[PDB]
């Protein structure tokens, strides 16, 4: 359907999906399954798209949408209501609870342990990726990273992700080896976000890494892209214990 199913050795206890722009009600340039409430779309259309998502994904409960600020804070999903959802990642060990990260070029990373008793979702735009959102998400697991699986969701691929030296400086400041992921391209660099994610995951001992095959910018029939469209919708990536 509209939904991507992660190609990873997913535990029996785990369910996951990642939305596309297909199968909603929003008009261009939000066309059609826009899940974003802060990008200037009709709030009634977004509401209806979030309902279509809930049904298409057979989610057991409403996704816990975060107040994403492109940082490295993780929200442990211990039960609604929540005082503050100011975070760029969520962690769950609670059956039926849905971790959700909202993107349109930023890397969504979905995580679970081999046992299929812990899950998480992280929003890794370059700012949060650089800051350590993936490392902070992995550090919320009780299980050792050797037993953690990660799935690199649809993000802006290295064909498309032109950045200035400012972004390269920021990553190399934290871990010089990030240099490998930035390739000179005119007066700017092409950044490999999947490569930077693989670096950070390896840094905390996550070795079992899947996905990384998509490009939100290039695959315009399937994804919104902030870089491509500027005014556009948002996809989201979801994981839960069944
Ligand atoms: C992290 C990521 O993939 N994208 C995020 C990033 O956009 P980005 O597109 O990178 O914009 P920039 O940060 O302003 O710029 C980052 C670097 O890239 C250079 N550049 C930018 C645009 C261009 O055409 N050419 C070019 O070279 C610029 O000069 C700087 O060095 O920042 C936006 C807020 O400003 C976020 O909304 C967006 O998140 C999305 C929605 C999401 O959460 O899914």
Written description of the protein model:
By secondary structure, the protein is α+β, with helices and mostly antiparallel strands. The protein has one domain (1-242). The chain has 6 helices and 12 strands. The chain has helices spanning 43-56, 126-131, 133-139, 165-174, 193-203, 226-229; strands spanning 14-18, 74-76, 89-92, 98-103, 107-113, 119-124, 148-152, 162-163, 182-185, 188-191, 208-211, 235-241. Strand 9 and strand 10 form a beta hairpin. It is globular. Ligand EPZ is lined by residues 103-106, 125-126, 156, 162-164, 166-167, 188, 226-227. Its EC number is 2.4.2.1, 3.5.4.4, 1.10.3.-, 2.4.2.28. Belongs to the purine nucleoside phosphorylase YfiH/LACC1 family. This is Purine nucleoside phosphorylase YfiH. Zn(2+) binds at residues 70, 106, 123. Keywords: Copper, Hydrolase, Metal-binding, Oxidoreductase, Transferase, Zinc.
Topology at a glance:
Blueprint (H helix, E strand, L loop, with lengths): L13 E5 L24 H14 L17 E3 L12 E4 L5 E6 L3 E7 L5 E6 L1 H6 L1 H7 L8 E5 L9 E2 L1 H10 L7 E4 L2 E4 L1 H11 L4 E4 L14 H4 L5 E7 L1
Parallel strand pairs: 2-3, 7-11
Antiparallel strand pairs: 1-12, 3-6, 4-12, 5-6, 5-7, 8-10, 9-10
Tell me the fraction of residues in β-strands, as a range. Answer: 15-25%
Number of helices: 6
Largest sheet: 6 strands, mixed
Overall number of domains: 1
Fraction of residues in H or I helices: 10-25%
Bound chemical compounds:
ligand EPZ
By secondary-structure content and strand pairing, the structural class works out as: alpha+beta
H/E series: EHEEEEEHHEEHEEHEHE
N→C terminal distance: 20 Å
Number of separate strands: 12
**Order of neighbouring strands in the sheet with most strands:** 2-3-6-5-7-11
Oligomer description: monomer
Instruction: Please state the overall shape, judged from the principal axes of the Cα atoms.
Output: globular
Radius of gyration: 17 Å
PDB class: hydrolase
Keywords: hydrolase, DUF152, amidase
Assembly: monomeric
Entry title: Crystal structure of YfiH with C107A mutation in complex with UDP-MurNAc-L-Serine
